[PDB]
Automatic annotation (TrEMBL), chain A:
Compartments in which it is found: Cytoplasm
GO biological process: formation of cytoplasmic translation initiation complex; viral translational termination-reinitiation
Domain of life: Eukaryota
Primary localization class, coarse: cytoplasm
Residues of the full protein shown: 224 to 595 of 607
The gene coding this protein: EIF3L
Protein name, entry field: Eukaryotic translation initiation factor 3 subunit L
Physiological role: Component of the eukaryotic translation initiation factor 3 (eIF-3) complex, which is required for several steps in the initiation of protein synthesis. The eIF-3 complex associates with the 40S ribosome and facilitates the recruitment of eIF-1, eIF-1A, eIF-2:GTP:methionyl-tRNAi and eIF-5 to form the 43S pre-initiation complex (43S PIC). The eIF-3 complex stimulates mRNA recruitment to the 43S PIC and scanning of the mRNA for AUG recognition.
From TrEMBL, chain B:
Gene transcribed to yield this protein: EIF3F
Domain of life the protein comes from: Eukaryota
Name of this chain's protein: Eukaryotic translation initiation factor 3 subunit F
Oligomeric and partner information: Component of the eukaryotic translation initiation factor 3 (eIF-3) complex, which is composed of 13 subunits: EIF3A, EIF3B, EIF3C, EIF3D, EIF3E, EIF3F, EIF3G, EIF3H, EIF3I, EIF3J, EIF3K, EIF3L and EIF3M. The eIF-3 complex appears to include 3 stable modules: module A is composed of EIF3A, EIF3B, EIF3G and EIF3I; module B is composed of EIF3F, EIF3H, and EIF3M; and module C is composed of EIF3C, EIF3D, EIF3E, EIF3K and EIF3L. EIF3C of module C binds EIF3B of module A and EIF3H of module B, thereby linking the three modules. EIF3J is a labile subunit that binds to the eIF-3 complex via EIF3B.
Location relative to the cell: Cytoplasm
Species annotation: Oryctolagus cuniculus
Complete-protein stretch covered: 274 to 364 of 364
TrEMBL record, chain C:
Domain of life where this protein originates: Eukaryota
Signal sequence interval, chain numbering: none
Gene Ontology CC terms: eukaryotic 43S preinitiation complex; eukaryotic 48S preinitiation complex; eukaryotic translation initiation factor 3 complex; nucleus
Domain PCI: start-end pairs: 41-203
Similarity remark: Belongs to the eIF-3 subunit K family.
Name of this chain's protein: Eukaryotic translation initiation factor 3 subunit K
Organism: Oryctolagus cuniculus
GO-annotated biological processes: formation of cytoplasmic translation initiation complex; regulation of translational initiation
Record Pfam families: CSN8_PSD8_EIF3K (PF10075)
Gene from which the chain derives: EIF3K
One Gene Ontology term of the molecular function aspect: ribosome binding
PROSITE patterns registered for this protein in UniProt: PCI
Cellular localization per UniProt: Nucleus; Cytoplasm
The protein's role, per its UniProt record: Component of the eukaryotic translation initiation factor 3 (eIF-3) complex, which is required for several steps in the initiation of protein synthesis. The eIF-3 complex associates with the 40S ribosome and facilitates the recruitment of eIF-1, eIF-1A, eIF-2:GTP:methionyl-tRNAi and eIF-5 to form the 43S pre-initiation complex (43S PIC). The eIF-3 complex stimulates mRNA recruitment to the 43S PIC and scanning of the mRNA for AUG recognition.
Chief place where the protein resides: nucleus
UniProtKB/TrEMBL annotation, chain D:
List of residues that carry Phosphoserine: 155
Keywords, in A-Z order: Cytoplasm, Initiation factor, Phosphoprotein, Protein biosynthesis
Region feature Disordered, mapped onto this chain: 237-282
Protein name per the record: Eukaryotic translation initiation factor 3 subunit H
Organism expressing this protein natively: Oryctolagus cuniculus (Rabbit)
Record field: transmembrane: none
């Protein structure tokens, strides 16, 4: 008790709100202009909008926990409660934008992602900073999925910066905000490991204390001590298709046991080779075009014994991220060295100290005008 | 902004002046009052702007581009440090 | 000339209402059968099949799982084996020819082709059945070298490509706008194409900051 | 168009006013804040057209003691004989600083603006600001401050006036925009030192060729800034550390003393309850030091926005020009 009739209440009024929100959002504009007129408060039905989307994503996954096989919950939610509200007369608000967010909650959860084209196609509307922080949250995942870390890092540094003036402050994020920030820590830690030396992007979001933390963390993973491969994914296992968090752990039932084995077995595949490619590249770019003596003299740490040293290093040299080369009778082992500076980070941070003063002005200046 | 407009206006006087005193001697007998008067003052333009073509001095400047950014950054941060510190008086 | 027939069926499922339900493992099995015929790809096709296999591991096939695997592997260096194993569970990963072509993916997505085509079964139930597997994988083979490698040897290309000396070495060689180098290796592209630095042209960014600092 | 708050207009300083200013420019008082006169204008269409202003001579050997009003009373008699009456619509200085609002002179500016609300107070800037952005700063003081008068007082009339929160900087008016035709003959002086006696026009373009090349222009200014931001900023924060050594850190222990005694005795006083809560010296705000603290730190940042752009435009020019 204190679980199941609540599950019913939530999911019944979810699919009932899906009914009268799908039907009166397609052709007519009567409800539209009456919800404009009567409640000028443009708030409580941007609240309904997001709150129910979050508890829907959670509670249908709470029903999935029991109905693993031939399970109605995710089908009836994902098709009619998400994709019928998707195909809609694009309303003049953050309603149509939140419908495609509300389904992308499930479309990231269940990992059949490559109409990422259509997710950013259908909205020709103003992605509100409150909503575009969620877009970064949503799309950044789809580009760590596509085996492109070097430009998927471009998505997460800006949201853990939270630089785009985020405040609401009407129970709207909602009720799970610092856990969202903690998942944003997982994603920036993820895009730091196999990339450093390359960024030049663990400056802005992650700062010196928990930067050197995730430094010592990711570099001991890079050294080949997999305590951090272990810890990162041990505390990131549900974080890719979690409900919001599962209901209640007991002893007996096998149904509950399947979806957590499901989230283990399929995305443990992703992280095994993440830490492999990290440890393959780990070691520094010491010398440029090494002679075959210096090639083997560096494979003394990198990979020897003995035979098949050179040809397993070929397996380490064909990655799209390892520019090497072997000239035969010249006997020249060519290798690249991709560097970056640091002092070039003061171009829009300087505009941000300007807007930070203007922000320090805002709250106190309306106080002044209201008091006056 | 406007003393750079008149700095450009000076540079218009140069080009319109230098072109005609050239093309006058392309025709016949120009660069008379412009042989080693403006010819000396073309040399006087380039005496102190620009410097010959020294890329070592361009690096000196490119580090100048770093230190003004800093002078300018310190500048707009102490703008923030006005309301930041000085006005939590304002609560 | 069969993916011209079916892409309509693919696109109307692709943007449809029958991707989650145990309803549509019939038509996109047969579009990717056609993809296997004439070397066209679309992740969404097999994605909808592996989708309702994730939904309820009960309908999951074996040789059609190999059709998902091969057509995801043959289209390298695209990232398709990620969303293969993101739905193929340990429940699904312990049969044949599943766990064979799962390990073939472990080899191909990190480049281990000599050991692939060495311990490889010379012909599979699927090899010529899905025509273009050999060339498309061996296109990717030469691509990772051509992109991030300066000087390839004649023997080490032939060794890496798999169990060959000179003939198909020079076939895979000359077809890529490659030049022969003096007695004897292959020139694939520039040797100063090694370093590849794109951003140390910093410090001319007065313009972009000044844009705000006029006021 | 050029109205402030109810009474005031903008100022219009034609160039013939500017020249009696820069005669007593930054000399007869170089490192001495000479109040270089009172802006004798008049009230015409949208603008306080200044016509003639007289430089006030503070006893300037090394300091500035206020000289005779008999000077001002004969300079007004003097201007009345041939020119306008003493329609003082502001006062002006330069004087040895780049964009600073002097607090004691801001009180001289406040009572001036309480007397005549139609007033903007000029801060001239010659090349000492390093040229440099905003040279003529006709800075008037907030009318919401001129409302809560007098003046900015320290402990009382600080929280009260900073709940009213009158602005700190307000209405640095646009000065000299239009062909007023006072002009006339200094135009007719341009066409002659455009013409064959042109030796003097170049020598003004010389004050261009021995400005830059040699003058610490960034460094010595940044060193004087390197002195200003270490004393002024730490002191405001020493204020904003001493104020809540008293606001909370005291009232943390003041209520700790009060709450401990069960908040009084039933049958008697309530002796120590009346004794406890003795208000600290800054109970609220300290918004008198601080407002001009707002102004002068915001003024640090105009010098800083000066040291911003003055810089940039060399780094532009010498990366531009050099590169050929």
């Amino acid at each position: 008790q204190w679980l199941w009739d609540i599950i019913d209440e939530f999911i019944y009024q979810f699919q009932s709100f899906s009914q009268y929100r799908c039907k009166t959002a397609k052709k007519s504009e009567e409800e539209i202009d009456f919800l404009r007129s009567n409640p000028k408060i443009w708030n409580v039905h941007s609240v309904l909008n997001v709150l129910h989307s979050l508890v829907d994503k959670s509670n249908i996954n709470r029903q999935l926990e029991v109905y693993t096989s031939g399970g109605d919950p995710e089908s009836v939610a994902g098709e009619y409660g998400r994709h019928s509200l998707y195909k809609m007369l694009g309303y003049f608000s953050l309603v149509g934008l939140l419908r495609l967010h509300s389904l992308l909650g499930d479309y990231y959860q269940a990992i059949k992602v490559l109409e990422n084209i259509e997710l950013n196609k259908k909205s020709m509307y103003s992605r509100v900073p409150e909503c575009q922080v969620t877009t970064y949250y949503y799309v950044g995942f789809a580009y760590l999925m596509m085996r492109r870390y070097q430009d998927a890092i471009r998505v997460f540094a800006n949201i853990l910066l939270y630089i785009q003036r985020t405040k609401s402050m009407f129970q709207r994020t909602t009720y799970k905000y610092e856990m969202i920030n903690k998942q944003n820590e997982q994603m920036h830690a993820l895009l730091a490991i196999a990339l450093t030396m390359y960024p030049m992007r663990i400056d802005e979001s992650i700062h010196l204390q928990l930067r050197e933390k995730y430094g010592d963390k990711m570099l001991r993973m890079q050294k080949g001590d997999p305590q951090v491969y272990e810890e990162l994914f041990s505390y990131s296992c549900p974080k890719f298709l979690s409900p919001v968090v599962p209901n209640y752990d007991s002893v007996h039932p096998n149904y509950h046991k399947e979806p957590f084995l499901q989230q283990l077995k399929v995305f443990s595949d992703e992280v095994q080779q993440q830490a492999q490619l990290s440890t393959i590249r780990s070691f520094l770019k010491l010398y440029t075009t090494m002679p075959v003596a210096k090639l083997a003299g560096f494979l003394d740490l990198t990979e020897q014994e003995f035979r098949i040293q050179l040809l397993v290093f070929k397996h380490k040299m064909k990655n799209l991220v390892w520019t090497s080369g072997i000239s035969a009778l010249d006997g020249e082992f060519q290798s690249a060295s991709e560097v970056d500076f640091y002092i070039d980070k003061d171009m829009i941070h300087i505009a941000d100290t300007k807007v930070a003063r203007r922000y320090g002005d805002f709250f106190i200046r309306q106080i002044h005008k209201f008091e006056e | 902004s406007d003393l750079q407009q008149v700095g450009g206006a000076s540079a218009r006087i140069q080009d319109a002046l230098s072109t005609v005193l050239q093309y006058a001697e392309d025709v016949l007998s120009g660069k008379v009052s412009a042989d080693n008067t403006v010819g000396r003052f073309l040399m006087s333009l380039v005496n102190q702007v620009p410097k010959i073509v020294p890329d070592d001095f361009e690096t000196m400047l490119n580090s100048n581009i770093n230190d003004l950014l800093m002078v300018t950054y310190l500048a707009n941060l102490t703008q923030s440090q006005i309301a930041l510190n000085e006005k939590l008086v304002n609560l | 000339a069969m993916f011209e027939q079916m892409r309509a069926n693919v696109g109307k499922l692709l943007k449809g209402i029958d991707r989650y339900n145990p309803e549509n493992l019939a038509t996109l099995e047969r579009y990717v059968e056609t993809q296997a015929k004439e070397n066209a790809y679309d992740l969404e096709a097999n994605l909808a099949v592996l989708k309702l296999y994730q939904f309820n591991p009960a309908f999951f096939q074996t040789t059609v799982t190999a059709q998902i695997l091969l057509k995801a592997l043959t289209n390298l260096p695209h990232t398709d084996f990620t969303l293969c194993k993101c739905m193929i569970d340990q429940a699904h990963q312990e049969e044949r020819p599943i766990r064979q072509i799962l390990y073939l993916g472990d080899l191909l997505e990190t480049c281990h082709f000599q050991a692939f085509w060495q311990a490889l079964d010379e012909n599979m139930d699927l090899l010529e059945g899905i025509t273009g597997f050999e060339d498309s994988v061996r296109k990717f083979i030469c691509h990772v070298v051509g992109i991030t490698y300066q000087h390839i040897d004649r023997w080490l290309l032939a060794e890496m490509l798999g169990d060959l000396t000179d003939s198909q070495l020079k076939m895979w060689m000359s077809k890529y706008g490659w030049s022969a180098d003096e007695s004897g290796q292959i020139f694939i592209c520039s040797q100063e194409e090694s370093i590849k630095p794109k951003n140390i042209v910093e410090k001319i960014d007065f313009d972009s900051v000044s844009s705000i600092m006029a006021s | 168009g050029g109205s402030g708050d109810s009474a005031v207009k903008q100022v219009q300083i034609d160039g013939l006013v500017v020249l009696k200013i820069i005669k007593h420019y930054q000399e007869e008082g170089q490192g001495t804040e000479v109040v270089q006169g009172v802006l004798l204008g008049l009230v015409v269409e949208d603008r306080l057209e200044i016509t003639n202003c007289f430089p006030f001579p503070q006893h300037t050997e090394d300091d500035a003691d206020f000289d005779e009003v008999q000077y001002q009373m004969e300079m007004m008699r003097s201007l009345r004989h041939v020119n306008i009456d003493h329609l003082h619509v502001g006062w002006y200085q330069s004087t040895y600083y780049g964009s600073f609002v002097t607090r004691a002179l801001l009180d001289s500016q406040f009572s001036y603006q309480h007397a005549i609300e139609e007033s903007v107070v000029l801060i001239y800037d010659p090349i000492k600001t390093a040229q440099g952005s905003l040279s003529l700063k006709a800075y008037r003081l907030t009318p919401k401050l001129m409302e809560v008068c007098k003046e900015k007082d320290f402990s009382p009339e600080a929280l009260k006036k900073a709940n009213i929160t009158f602005e700190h900087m307000f209405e640095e008016v646009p000065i000299v925009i239009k062909n007023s035709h006072l002009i006339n003959v200094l135009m007719w002086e341009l066409e002659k030192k455009s013409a064959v006696a042109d030796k003097h026009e170049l020598l003004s373009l010389a004050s261009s060729n021995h400005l830059g090349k040699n003058l610490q222009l960034l460094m010595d200014r940044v060193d004087e800034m390197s002195q200003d931001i270490v004393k002024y900023n730490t002191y405001m924060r020493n204020t904003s550390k001493q104020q809540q050594q008293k606001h909370q850190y005291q009232q943390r222990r003041q209520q700790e003393n009060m709450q401990r005694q069960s908040r009084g005795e039933p049958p008697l006083p309530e002796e120590d309850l009346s004794k406890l809560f003795k208000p600290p010296q800054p109970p609220a705000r300290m918004d008198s030091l601080l407002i001009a603290g707002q102004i002068n730190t915001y003024c640090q940042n105009i010098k800083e926005f000066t040291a911003q752009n003055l810089g940039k435009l060399f780094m532009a020019q010498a990366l531009q020009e050099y590169n050929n």
